[PDB]
Amino acid sequence: HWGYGKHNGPEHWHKDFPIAKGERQSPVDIDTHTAKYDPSLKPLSVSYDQATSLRILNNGHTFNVEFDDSQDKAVLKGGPLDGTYRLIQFHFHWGSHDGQGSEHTVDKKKYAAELHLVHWNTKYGDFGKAVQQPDGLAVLGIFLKVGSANPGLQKVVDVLDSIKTKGKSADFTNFDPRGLLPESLDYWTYPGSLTTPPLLECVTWIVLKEPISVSSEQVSKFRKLNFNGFGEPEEPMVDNWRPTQPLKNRQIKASFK
């Protein structure tokens, strides 16, 4: 079983998942001195007014908030994307301390956490079909910068004590994902991958320029989750981030000057 420990962590994933050394792996470092403004890039259209959250789950690697994805209600369009992508889940990556935790970096800067809002391309019918395609997913990556407490996160923080160990889940209705968005939707974009095994190269990454805030106390609550399940030794869920991978032949485009 892959994980984030010394023995089963990112450095070793290529043994069981050889695509880990592929041509379009994520995350990447975003060099603002080389990412090119593309004035043709469209504004992002985020339509979450009618999103329906359902549950929250500790999967042993992160926690996921799952949404109903039966209809074109909660959707991402525009930006670099063709067509409509439905929100299916979001999750976070975070550190053992406030100085690290993000997967993407900006000029090598690491944030305390990173939010991934995962969407799939409706041209492919469902998530499982979409992940087999290079344009199957669109993921909105949002940095969390330590500062003031974020009221948009509080409902998540307040439920985490009910999903402490792997396999636990809880009902989680009426969560508004709009509260996790920054004011500006300026972004960088590039083609990449899932950041966990199976590391499939099926993602259009859309990384927002503006972080959202998080208080130190809020991100300390993430660290009270555990990677392990029942009967396994206790292992705090911290440093569940993959480090940046080679950009190779790819171009990171900026939507903003």
Q: 93 among the known binding-site residues?
A: yes
14 is known as an active-site residue: no
Q: Which stretch binds Zn ion (CB under 5 A): 43-51, 162-170, 188-196, 224-232?
A: 188-196
Q: Which stretch binds Zn ion (CB under 5 A): 31-39, 183-191, 193-201, 235-243?
A: 193-201
Structure tokens at 165: 């160990």
Q: 1 among the known binding-site residues?
A: no
Residue nearest to Zn ion (CB): 116
Alpha carbon 177 to chain centroid distance? Answer: 13
- What contacts 201, CB < 8 A, 6 or more positions away? 19, 22, 23, 24, 25, 134, 191, 192, 193
Which of 43, 44, 42, 46 has the alpha carbon at shortest distance from 73?
Answer: 46
Q: 196 among the known binding-site residues?
A: yes
Alpha carbon 217 to chain centroid distance? Answer: 21
Total residues in contact with Zn ion, by rule CB under 5 A: 2
233-240, long-range: CB within 8 Å, 24+ apart, which pairs? 235/5, 236/96, 237/58, 237/61, 237/62, 238/94, 238/95, 238/96, 239/4, 239/94, 239/95, 239/96, 239/100, 239/101, 240/4, 240/61, 240/62, 240/93, 240/94
Least Å from the CB of residue 114 to Zn ion: 7
- Closer residue to Zn ion (CB): 49 or 112: 112
Least Å from the CB of residue 12 to Zn ion: 19
Q: 116 among the known binding-site residues?
A: yes
- What contacts 248, CB < 8 A, 6 or more positions away? 23, 24
Q: 14 among the known binding-site residues?
A: no
Q: Which stretch binds Zn ion (CB under 5 A): 42-50, 105-113, 192-200, 241-249?
A: 192-200
Alpha carbon 218 to chain centroid distance? Answer: 18
Check binding of 61 to Zn ion (CB under 5 A). Answer: no
Q: What x/- string results for residues 145 through 184 when contact with Zn ion is judged by CB under 5 A? A: ----------------------------------------
Structure tokens at 55: 């549950």
Least Å from the CB of residue 63 to Zn ion: 11
Eight-class DSSP state of 236: B
Q: Name which of residues 87 to 146 contact Zn ion (CB under 5 A).
A: 116
Considering 7, 14, 61, 104, which one is annotated as catalytic? 61
**Would you say how long the chain is, in residues?**
257
Least Å from the CB of residue 194 to Zn ion: 7
Give the annotated binding-site residues.
91, 93, 116, 195-196
Query: Which residue ranges make up the site for Zn ion (CB under 5 A)?
Result: 116, 195
Give the annotated binding-site residues for Zn(2+).
91, 93, 116
Q: Which residues belong to the active site?
A: 61
